[PDB]
Chain length 143, copies 14
Amino acid sequence: SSRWSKDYDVCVCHSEEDLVAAQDLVSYLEGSTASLRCFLQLRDATPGGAIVSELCQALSSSHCRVLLITPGFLQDPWCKYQMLQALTEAPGAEGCTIPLLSGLSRAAYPPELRFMYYVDGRGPDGGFRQVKEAVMRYLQTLS
Amino acid sequence: SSRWSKDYDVCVCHSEEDLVAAQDLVSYLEGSTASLRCFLQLRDATPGGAIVSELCQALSSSHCRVLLITPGFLQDPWCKYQMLQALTEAPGAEGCTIPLLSGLSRAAYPPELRFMYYVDGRGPDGGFRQVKEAVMRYLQTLS
Amino acid sequence: SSRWSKDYDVCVCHSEEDLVAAQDLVSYLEGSTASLRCFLQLRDATPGGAIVSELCQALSSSHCRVLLITPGFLQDPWCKYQMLQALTEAPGAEGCTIPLLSGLSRAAYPPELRFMYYVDGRGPDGGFRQVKEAVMRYLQTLS
Amino acid sequence: SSRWSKDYDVCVCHSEEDLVAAQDLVSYLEGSTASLRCFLQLRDATPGGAIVSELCQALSSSHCRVLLITPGFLQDPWCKYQMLQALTEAPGAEGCTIPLLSGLSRAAYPPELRFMYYVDGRGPDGGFRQVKEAVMRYLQTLS
Amino acid sequence: SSRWSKDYDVCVCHSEEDLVAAQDLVSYLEGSTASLRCFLQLRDATPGGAIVSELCQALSSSHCRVLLITPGFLQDPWCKYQMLQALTEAPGAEGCTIPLLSGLSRAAYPPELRFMYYVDGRGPDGGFRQVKEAVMRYLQTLS
Amino acid sequence: SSRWSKDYDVCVCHSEEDLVAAQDLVSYLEGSTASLRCFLQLRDATPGGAIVSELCQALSSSHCRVLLITPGFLQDPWCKYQMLQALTEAPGAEGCTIPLLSGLSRAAYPPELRFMYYVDGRGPDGGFRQVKEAVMRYLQTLS
Amino acid sequence: SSRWSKDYDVCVCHSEEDLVAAQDLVSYLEGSTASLRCFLQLRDATPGGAIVSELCQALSSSHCRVLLITPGFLQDPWCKYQMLQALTEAPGAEGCTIPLLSGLSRAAYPPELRFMYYVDGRGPDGGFRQVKEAVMRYLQTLS
Amino acid sequence: SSRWSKDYDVCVCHSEEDLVAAQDLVSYLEGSTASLRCFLQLRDATPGGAIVSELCQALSSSHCRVLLITPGFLQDPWCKYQMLQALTEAPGAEGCTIPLLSGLSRAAYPPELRFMYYVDGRGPDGGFRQVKEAVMRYLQTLS
Amino acid sequence: SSRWSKDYDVCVCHSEEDLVAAQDLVSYLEGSTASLRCFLQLRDATPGGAIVSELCQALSSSHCRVLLITPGFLQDPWCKYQMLQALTEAPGAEGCTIPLLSGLSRAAYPPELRFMYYVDGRGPDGGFRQVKEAVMRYLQTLS
Amino acid sequence: SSRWSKDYDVCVCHSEEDLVAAQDLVSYLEGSTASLRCFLQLRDATPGGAIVSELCQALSSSHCRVLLITPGFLQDPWCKYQMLQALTEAPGAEGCTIPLLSGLSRAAYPPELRFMYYVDGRGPDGGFRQVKEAVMRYLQTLS
Amino acid sequence: SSRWSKDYDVCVCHSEEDLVAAQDLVSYLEGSTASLRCFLQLRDATPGGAIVSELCQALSSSHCRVLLITPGFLQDPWCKYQMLQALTEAPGAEGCTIPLLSGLSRAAYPPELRFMYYVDGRGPDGGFRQVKEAVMRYLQTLS
Amino acid sequence: SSRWSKDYDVCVCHSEEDLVAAQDLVSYLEGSTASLRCFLQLRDATPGGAIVSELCQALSSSHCRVLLITPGFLQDPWCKYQMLQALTEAPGAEGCTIPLLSGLSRAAYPPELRFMYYVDGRGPDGGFRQVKEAVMRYLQTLS
Amino acid sequence: SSRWSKDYDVCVCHSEEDLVAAQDLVSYLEGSTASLRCFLQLRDATPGGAIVSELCQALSSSHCRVLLITPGFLQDPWCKYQMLQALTEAPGAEGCTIPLLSGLSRAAYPPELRFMYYVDGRGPDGGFRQVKEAVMRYLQTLS
Amino acid sequence: SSRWSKDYDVCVCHSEEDLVAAQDLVSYLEGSTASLRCFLQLRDATPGGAIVSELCQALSSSHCRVLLITPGFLQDPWCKYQMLQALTEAPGAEGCTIPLLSGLSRAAYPPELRFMYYVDGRGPDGGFRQVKEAVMRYLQTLS
């Protein structure tokens, strides 16, 4: 194992609209902590594979996972698939699940996710900062 | 053990409305006594865990616990859960329970809590000061 | 309100190890009580559908929750999450929110005893009778 | 006022070690005295409900309190808190507020002797008869 | 919408090892249910035509998908790709999107259990009856 | 085998209109990685053979294959033949299949290909760069 | 002077989280009061235009200011700057300069209480009625 | 001045991916508003001519600019330069200088929000109606 | 010998229901005294051996042995076998026998065991603490 | 001998349905301990031999043997043959016999096997981990 | 219950060295006692059948077990396993569960003496008479 | 009460070295005294049964205890435990609880002399006569 | 970070007319404090970039920013763009905004800027000196 | 690449009249920085090629490009062709575009070029010096 039991340390689950926020969060995570690796579908997924298989890999080969909850995320079925699969694994070692409610401005929260604790506030206003610390506690735990 | 039998020294049980009062009390406690640690859900709880589990941790890993009794606290079910679980542990070592009746202006007091002694007056008017001394007696006791 | 304004009148949260016990208990409720319709994820969750989501919906769309907790239940995380979620759904119980552990030690039950008493004793048959009477009392009081 | 204007006419505060003794004593009261309805947390506190809160409510919503104190009772903190609370509820007794320690040493009883005499002597059977007569005297005087 | 607005009302995704089982299951559906027309690539895909493309079209041009998964199915890549594609076609199921593995171990089924429950149990005959009822429920709900 | 299990490392599947883009991609692939060989029909196919046989050779003697999806590619039946034959071989060793949606400007994607992951963006804007890395992962895998 | 000599008669300073509440409140004012025209930056600030500048202009070009302060408002700096600026625009209030925090704790409100009382209490519906009466009183007194 | 003193009354800056959306929007403007003539580089830039230069001229020789910004637009440098240039042409807007991103996330829009508000919301149809009303308001105010 | 004449220092004899209490006692024993080893059947017994042989090993290879007397322990025949075999060895070196009457709440005591002294009170209320000291006297004796 | 008195170190006795669980267990055993060899019938048995002879070889040339008890295992006569032959050899050197009750969820246990100790819990939930340690004790013993 | 409700009334567990002694003992029981039917694996286990399984079944399907233990018996593992299993079958004896070692030293007997006394003494003939009387006492008490 | 209301009228606690002496003494009692039935573990404890438990039961289920203490008895721990237990069973003697050490030094007898006199002197024959008379006196007084 | 979180420490926002005053201020700032870097467009901006992009860089890569408010500054749209973009960032870390009213001789102040505090007096008469100290407080804050 | 990704480092775009200024600038660039290569048409272009092709080479094989804007440059169509082709490539790697307005004395600037930043002042008066530094930033960037 030696710090990388999983290949990836975090995966940001996000729609095409949410790419700007996701990239800013990933740059913040990867840059601040130096040795962290986030999964982003543009660079870390591989063409020719099935989309579901690449998502299963993103789901299963990462220590932690972040849900950027936005109306684009609510609209997109790939985001729904990631949200549904990350439901029972939230404090787990198979991808700990961190919801960040940036696009709904910390108001609406999916009804199934309710009992699981989430990153409150908006991403730039403290959410990204909270996500990094929350992920870091799991990364230390799973090291 | 060595002064920290419990990870936390105090936990302020309070609603979203009560955050300003809770933060002022926590800053007063943490700053005045230097080495004290309060549990506050924004920083000391971890996303991805269940909310009840994070509350159980806050309840069980703290030497003392403060109930900020306010109409927001009366409204909020998480505050009710903390109040109900802290009922039989009030002078105990599993989180000594200090009620401070700031938001009801020391008038109304929950009917179950009645037989347990509480911090009288309002928080800025002496309640925070009383909470610090009351918690400090328990911290010395449990050191 | 009513005994049967919602889609379901009772719902039993239970493990795949608990199916026989839950079905026998439901047969008493659903036969004895006029117009009663219970949710059981064995029969009421159709293939193709989202069984976890449907059980999550059943907790809030029922007039009564019964939570059957067994040592097999305590080994299944998704079932435990549904039970933990049911506590978040109904902290005031909303009629029934009955933990059932009759014929089983107190140590098995989570520490929610104060505000949510469980079906206690070493008699399993008496536990079913107690739940059946409790369900009738809760439906009568709720209506 | 009345023997039976409130929901309950008698309530017995007692341990889970004391259930047989309390139920036998209640059977004498509830059979002998016309219209009498006693609270026992064994039967009157429904599963799902808040048993500690219901017992707390029973002390004030009863016309009479009997407090059964045994060496098993003195080892249970929540029961002791309910008895201590019962003293806060009824310092003038409000008809019955009877500590029962018949067949047991005086040293066991808390030092409230002056203003709240307990059922004394080495006879257990005579103690039940004394409580039964006392309950009738208190209901007659209260009405 | 309708039970039969589209060209096909049901389609069964299955292997060339599964033809007897799929045809027997379809015979129950297509005989029992009024106006029902199922796609089977055995009969509905004409020679000269593109059988893989026609089966791909059948998944979206059907009102219901049944996915028959067997150990023979799990050895055929084009069939597995059609099943994997069917999940991409209908993540919300669109009435039926039923994985059928009745009389077969859970380990065989891909990890889509949470949001897409499969026909479970050790009874093959009961599985066909469950699919038949499920197809009727899905057509009724869809219409 | 020794790095060349297949004679060719990549084959660009493209129409006569798409030759400029295909040649730029091939020059980029062959030049950047030094020892790579792409199949291009002008130089790597041999006159006197049947066109289908030369395409079968291009399909079967290459480690990877790239689909340049353009309206010329959609129009041309030879491109359709290559696309249809490369459908079930997409992550495989018989010519891994990489779609690049340059001519439709990453908008329209053939309906059958949908479930397979593709190179997003336009060729000069990052698509060629993505194709090289995606092919290189397969070339390392199949070395 | 007049109720309507200026371009706008009321203006509501509020967050993008507060749009529903502000619009509902404005609908009461603008329907009830003859000739009333309110500024809302949702509708009155045209695209292409300077929305912050237009809202800044609306504070001085209105006969009445209502300042809707919510925990979402307190997380938005430009909105807070507009509210802070509104205090600079109208320290004597000029008819309405009403902070609205009805159904919300006093701790949320900035310390301008002495010379600028806010709409207080735990009733949201009563707050709208109080603002509506206050707006009528201010327009009547101003005219 | 006038609604139509210049050669063009509206001009829409948009990508070759955006042609359908821009033409549909223009059809509403050019049909609804009397004497209106819009510049679209699809039709108004003649072959042989300098299309980039003609679009550059159209920004200053129009009474109104609408800037349609899409994720496809954000991938085209010459289009982005024309939009960036349009900001240099009309910082005070000169009637319309409307960024249109309706049905698209805020993160996509360049940080000119304060002094140049964009057409916001998740409704595309409502965005066209908002632009149409805005164009009429700008032409009326400009004249 | 050198402190470990026997391989194990203590063995907790307990039923499946009693595992929570047994584990808490074992964690308390092993953690408090640092170098102690308790036998627990889950980890210290080995599959493939006969259950009686593994129990004989647990009985014979431990310095001391604890009987957790509970109704589950009274029900279970393996617990009866351990109790019967530990009868004549109670102050001995072949597994000194410590009864702790937690589950009967120090009331009922098996009739054969009567003449042997036992740990009084309940486990959390002092019984575990007493067991540790009693075992420690034997461990010092047999060192 | 020198660590390999027997050719194989373990043999997983399992049905065709149980192959996924068996392979995961074998990968866990072979990978974790590095030099271990498990017998699996797909790779370690040789075609052309009689099935009984290959099973006799698997039974007799392995240090240890694991029974995966599942309904598929109960159904299959080859599994019955292995179970029957491994009955009297359970702690022995001719293939020590480890039962793991994964498919019956640790409930039902074959009536003959009863007196032999088994791996409790389910395979992923701790059973595989227990099997590895139990086998390792025998491998150390027989080294 | 009965002396003869089950298939067998007595069963003798014994070695292939013990056949003469067991048959002579059975002849006394089966001749003396009316309706008595004993299991002996010499005669009652038919060829082709599973002799070990049939003897295992005989222990539970008998009203009485006699366990004949000899130095020859102590050299046979399958016989010892059946005797060890018989202890697991009947720890409370269920009428007869008689170890017979008459005319043989105590050291030979396994250490189950306390709760399961063996036929003792140096007389073999007296041992048979003692077993015969014991079998009659056990059948009489059991009935 | 009676000489013979219980199952046994006398019981003799004695060693396996003491069988001849105990049987001879019992023969005098059981022959001389009408209806007398003595417990001797030599004859009254049936094989298969729990001999230690039966002797323990015999002490309380007898009308009289005789405790035969010899230097052989003083070397047997289970016998000494039964004698020590007999003192716990009958401290007031309940008729007979006679230590017999006639023909043996006082130093052999445990120090219970004051409240439990033993059969003293150097005559063994006179001791049996003294016990016989004592048993008759105790049965006569007890009845 | 280490004193330079931003590349520049200050940026003087000024028109072509104001260059003499801006250069004197910059020389005073850079020379007095030694290690400070101001952004001036003549030297610190780069030709070939768009003017807006160079201004965005000047706005975003500087710790602080100075507005030289002059009639030339009021006339120039680039100065308006800088003023408008620096409005909500005035005490912030993204370029703290210091207005110096030199050219209007501290009389006229832009209407939007009013609520933000400014450097009073004229530049040579104390304004430059005040700007240096005000910027230095922010530079110390952001170090 | 290694500092020369492009063959040329700069290209001065200038008319026949502007040759003296261009040569002085080129001598200054080439001489000052030592290893720089500028494209000048007299020496770096090759006769026999088409003039447009030689200009395309000058445009495409140079890291940076300088526009000497003069009335001769405005008159000459070759200069217009270079200016038009260098429009969208101004901060790019395909020839970064630096305008120097020497011949118009920094007054007139082509209307299309307006939004791109330029070298201000006259060439001898600082323009050449500015061009060298601006080009050097790009050369360092593209090294």
